[PDB]
Design a protein around this ligand. Structure first.
Ligand SMILES: Nc1nc(=O)c2c([nH]1)NC[C@H](CCc1ccc(C(=O)N[C@@H](CCC(=O)O)C(=O)O)cc1)C2
Ligand SMILES: Nc1nc(=O)c2c([nH]1)NC[C@H](CCc1ccc(C(=O)N[C@@H](CCC(=O)O)C(=O)O)cc1)C2
Ligand SMILES: [Ca+2]
Ligand SMILES: [Cl-]
Ligand SMILES: [Cl-]
Lengths: 159, 159
């Protein structure tokens, strides 16, 4: 099945012109825990942002342009991206906006990090219908010595 | 000689306990490049913020309470902290607020990172009369895909 994993600020802001104004090592630890050993599909902008390939995961870049790196798999279509994952139980889609939009309809589960930050965004997470999803796990945390803002983990399953 | 290194948001606000709302990896690289191979002195909250001994540096913690960990040197007073550094060219003071206050009088250099972020905070870096200090280096950088805000590195020398 396919899942989407994303961090959302208030109003579902997922991206800014520049780097997000928060420091959440615990959020990154949750993203790792939930994507390790799984294939991850991402757009080119998200890739360039990352820096390098995510260790221990098969990195798949969905883009219309030519691949610039031989350490990862470049695909031109959603179907292409999926086939490239092969036979696995779960496929994680990691953004950004456009990629999330394109895969939401096929998605069965959402792993979200709601962050308490009010920011002006460039891109937002597609709108999802709360009536259509079931919250199966939620966990609130306040900001602390290593995390700049308060955040909440949530996992939802399609009804 | 003694130097203090700090990251200041608008109005000289500095962290108190929770991590600051920004993400500036270029600033941590500057931090590292300037403290490596030198003794660093810090207070107890800074120490929780960091979360482990900084590698390649002699870690000195000034605090009135118990020395939890064995990997660093724990002192109860300024003089005690200084002594622990031994005979070296530069001692780096890394905060927090009170620690900065205690060492400023003795400081000969300041390494500051001015960040273009409006943050509500209780603490402020000690007021330094810019006239007793000579600004010897200043370099501005805009925010980008990896750094959430604009920042400006600056070195001041006490005259
Ligand atoms: N929970 C979550 N938080 C986020 O900040 C993001 C999402 N999801 N999904 C999309 C996107 C991901 C960007 C992203 C992902 C990983 C690393 C990283 O290096 N993680 C290490 C730890 C890793 O090994 O996963 C950095 C940026 C942003
Ligand atoms: N320039 C500057 N920026 C800051 O944010 C601070 C200061 N100074 N001085 C005080 C305090 C320091 C907090 C602080 C210091 C180091 C690391 C750290 O992880 N240091 C590594 C760098 C690792 C890296 O580049 O990720 C290091 O080895 O210095 C984190 C927090 C905060
Ligand atoms: Ca439930
Ligand atoms: Cl993208
Ligand atoms: Cl402190």
């Amino acid at each position: 099945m396919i899942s989407l994993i994303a961090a959302l600020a208030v109003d579902r802001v997922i991206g800014m012109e520049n780097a997000m104004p928060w420091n959440l090592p615990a959020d990154l630890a949750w993203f790792k825990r939930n994507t390790l050993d799984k294939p991850v599909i991402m757009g080119r902008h998200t890739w360039e942002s990352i820096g390098r390939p995510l260790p221990g995961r098969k990195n798949i870049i969905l883009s219309s342009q030519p691949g610039t790196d031989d350490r990862v798999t470049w695909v031109k279509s959603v179907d292409e991206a999926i086939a490239a994952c092969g036979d696995v139980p779960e496929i994680m889609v990691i953004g950004g906006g456009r990629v999330y939009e394109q895969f939401l309809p096929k998605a069965q589960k959402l792993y979200l990090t709601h962050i308490d930050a009010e920011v002006e965004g460039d891109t937002h997470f597609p709108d999802y219908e709360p009536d259509d999803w079931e919250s199966v796990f939620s966990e609130f945390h306040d900001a602390d010595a290593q995390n700049s803002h308060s955040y909440c983990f949530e996992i939802l399953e399609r009804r």
